[PDB]
Amino acid sequence: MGGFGLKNPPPQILIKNTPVPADPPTQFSSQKINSFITQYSTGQMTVEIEWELRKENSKRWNPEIQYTANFNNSANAQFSVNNNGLYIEDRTIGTRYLTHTL
Amino acid sequence: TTTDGTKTIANNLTSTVQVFADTEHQLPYILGSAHEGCMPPFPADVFMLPQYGYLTLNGPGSNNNNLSTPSSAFYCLEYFPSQMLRTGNNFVFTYEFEKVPFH
């Protein structure tokens, strides 16, 4: 599907709500505790990647194909939110534009 | 100089030739395609140097597949720094292969 094959990829990160049981009966029972307190959780996360990139030196004379926002007028701008508040992606953008000698 | 059908060849002392080696492989590389124009096998022969040329992407249109695609590259070789040589001065450089397995 494309990508970087890794022997030792980034570690999976797993999270759970710790169970909080509801009021236990007064008499003892060895069976599992069936009833819990309904709860959920929320909070922010952040991810910081450091990328290394190969600089481009090409002596070709004439200009190259490049990615350009669609030059047309439109009811909704490209890669932007619409009236209802929904973010819309126009184009899968490939990485291959700049030419290189074979 | 050509006067009638009699050529007159003189020696122009102030003219230059200009040469450069491309060490970054930024030009299309036509060596190793087994063309002619190498040194002769026998040291006493004199040979004429081959012309340089390359051919880029082509693309279809109408009945002609020979149209130039947008990404067809054009390389100007005067856009490379090169050393200009008169008759007195000379040119040299060295190169070192990376390790490859014995044949």
The 3-class SS string of chain B reads CEECCEECCCCCCCCCEEECCCCCCCCCCCCCCCCCCCCCCCCCCCCCCCCCCCCCCEEEECCEEEEECCCCCCCCHHHCCCEEECCCCCCCCCCCCCCCCCC
Residue B79 backbone phi and psi in degrees, to 5: -90, 5
C-alpha distances (whole Å) from A100 to each of A43, A59, A61, B29, B77 are 46, 10, 13, 12, 17
Instruction: List B19's β-bridge partners, or say none.
Output: B83
- Contact list, A58 vs chain B (CB under 8 Å): 26
Which tokens in the block code for residue B1?
Answer: 């100089």
Give the end-to-end CA distance of chain B in Å, rounded to a whole number: 52
- Contact list, B59 vs chain A (CB under 8 Å): none
Per the rule left: phi > 0, alpha: psi between -120 and 50, beta: everything else, B33 is alpha
- Contact list, B24 vs chain A (CB under 8 Å): 57
- Amino acid residing at B77: L
The minimal CB distance from A60 to the residues B24, B25, B74 is found for B74
The minimal CB distance from A59 to the residues B70, B71, B79 is found for B79
- Amino acid residing at B82: S
Maximum Cα–Cα distance for chain B, whole Å?
60
Of A16, A15, A14, A34, which Cα lies nearest the Cα of A24? A34
- Can you say whether the dihedral through the CA atoms of A62, B59, A57, A55 is positive or negative? positive
Which tokens in the block code for residue A26?
Answer: 């007064």
